[PDB]
Amino acid sequence: KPKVVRQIEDQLGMNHVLQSIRRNYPVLFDEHLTPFMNDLQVSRTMDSG
Amino acid sequence: KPKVVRQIEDQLGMNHVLQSIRRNYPVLFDEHLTPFMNDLQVSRTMDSG
Known about the structure:
This is part of a larger assembly, with 2 copies of chain A. In chain A, 43% of the residues lie in helices and 0% in strands. By secondary structure, chain A is an all-alpha fold. The PDB classes it as viral protein/rna. Keywords: transcription, matrix protein, VIRAL PROTEIN-RNA complex.
């Protein structure tokens, strides 16, 4: 069995990476990202910030 | 003399509060905030993030 002791909260949802990109790279989150999106509300309201 | 032991990094610039508002309240940072602004670049490029 894999002996990994992963410490990334073991969930690592898509809405977490999207939120982190929005926070860190906002100019890169607006352009080239999320033009084809309708669930920006959940990614915006601090989903496990 | 004031005996304060303030632990807020002692600088607390405007571009720090603006950046924190942009990160935490983006929908509140876009509307009702920064329509009359031309220095969004420094507040965007992680000024003492």
